[PDB]
């Protein structure tokens, strides 16, 4: 009954059920039983972005479909990767195989069937740099398919499966292209300080984690879903305003003259790093993540986002969006919404 052991952050709420599906059929089957028996249901990978606000009263199905198969291409590797397949896991392997191209996408909690949902990124890469497409399972017919990385509609913590294609796709596998001429990104932060003709792809690994075991929280310690909030993109005047009043801010101009700031420092700069609220606090090294600290309820996390939202908001007239998907009774509700 007990969803704690499947969501990185440790929220304790029950679920009608929870299976682990080892292959498609079952997951199918999983999803088909339910929804005869007329509830909803929820797919998860290893729940590291998830926040269950109450007990779902549907089945949560754990997806643990797993196998790696590697195609060969003259200028490329193609891996064809099973959903359950753990990312970091997954990251590694390609590494000691020889075949680099994920090394800055280290660490990222979470299955590789989750990857492409919020287009995992860090350090200078998003997934969509290296996904080839993407196969699901349309619950409904039991129809595979297969939408290729431009089909997935990529976007900064966001893709086609949080619109068009959520309830109705189960990923089942995801394609990643590796090219064969390894390039390095040295463009994120401290891996500037590295040369792209002396490094080596494990240099870049350790070095993005360890800017990564500074700052994020292992959730085996305090359970967490990673940065609690999406990094704002405001319009160039709110950013010019903005950065006459605190020129420091950090900023990420868009092609467009819109800008993005970085809620990490937003949070900061509200003195909001430790503050807690229940079982609940704002991590110390990275204000981003909300922790569990200490048997923290979901309202406890939902409060502290408030209180942090609100905060940010009176500061600096910027409204954080959650970045961490808020699972109501019957399914997905607006993280916002609920935070509002
Ligand atoms: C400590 C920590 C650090 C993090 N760092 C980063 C980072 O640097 N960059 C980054 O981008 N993200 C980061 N995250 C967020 C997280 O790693 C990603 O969101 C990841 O893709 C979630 O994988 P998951 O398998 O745990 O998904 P889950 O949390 O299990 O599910 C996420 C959402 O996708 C759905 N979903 C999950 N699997 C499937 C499937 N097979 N079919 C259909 N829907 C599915 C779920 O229903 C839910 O809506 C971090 C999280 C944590 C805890
Ligand atoms: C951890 C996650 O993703 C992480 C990802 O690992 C890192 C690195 O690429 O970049 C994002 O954090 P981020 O924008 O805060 O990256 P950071 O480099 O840590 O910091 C950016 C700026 O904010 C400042 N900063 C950040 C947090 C803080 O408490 N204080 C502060 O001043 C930094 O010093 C920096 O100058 C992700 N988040 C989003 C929401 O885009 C996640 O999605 O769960």
């Not at 509830?39 to 007990?55: A, H, R, T, Y």
């Not at 807690?276 to 979901?298: P, T």
């Amino acid at each position: 009954h007990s969803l704690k052991p499947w969501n990185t952050f440790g929220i304790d709420h029950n679920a009608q059920h929870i299976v682990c599906a080892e292959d498609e059929q079952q997951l199918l089957n999983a999803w088909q039983y339910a929804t005869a028996e007329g509830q909803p249901v929820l797919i998860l990978g290893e729940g590291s972005n998830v926040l269950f606000l109450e007990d779902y009263r549907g089945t949560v199905i754990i997806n643990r479909i797993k196998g790696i198969e590697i195609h060969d291409e003259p200028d490329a590797w193609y891996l064809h990767v099973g959903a359950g397949e753990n990312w970091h896991r997954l990251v590694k392997y390609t590494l000691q195989e020889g075949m680099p191209g994920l090394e800055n996408l280290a660490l990222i909690p979470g299955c590789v069937g989750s990857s492409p949902i919020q287009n995992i990124g860090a350090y200078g890469v998003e997934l969509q740099r290296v996904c080839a497409y993407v196969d699901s399972v349309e619950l409904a017919t039991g129809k595979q398919v297969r939408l290729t990385a431009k089909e997935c509609r990529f976007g900064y913590r966001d893709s086609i499966f949080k619109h068009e294609y959520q309830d109705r796709f189960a990923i089942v596998a995801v394609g990643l292209r590796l090219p064969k001429e390894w390039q390095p990104v040295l463009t994120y932060g401290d891996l500037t300080r590295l040369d792209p003709t002396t490094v080596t792809p494990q240099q870049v690994f350790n070095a993005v984690c360890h800017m990564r075991t500074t700052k994020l929280p292992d959730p085996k310690v305090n359970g967490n879903a990673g940065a609690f909030f999406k990094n704002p993109v405001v319009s160039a005047e709110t950013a010019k305003a903005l950065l006459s009043q605190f020129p420091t801010a950090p900023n990420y101009p868009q092609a467009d003259g819109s800008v993005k700031l970085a809620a990490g420092w937003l949070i900061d700069q509200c003195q909001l790093k430790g503050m807690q609220i229940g079982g609940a606090a704002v991590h110390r090294q990275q204000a981003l993540v909300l922790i569990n600290e200490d048997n923290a309820k979901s309202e406890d996390v939902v409060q502290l986002a408030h209180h942090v939202r609100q905060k940010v908001g009176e500061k600096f007239n910027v409204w954080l969006e959650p970045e961490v998907r808020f699972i109501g009774a019957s399914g997905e509700v607006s993280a916002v919404e609920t935070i509002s």
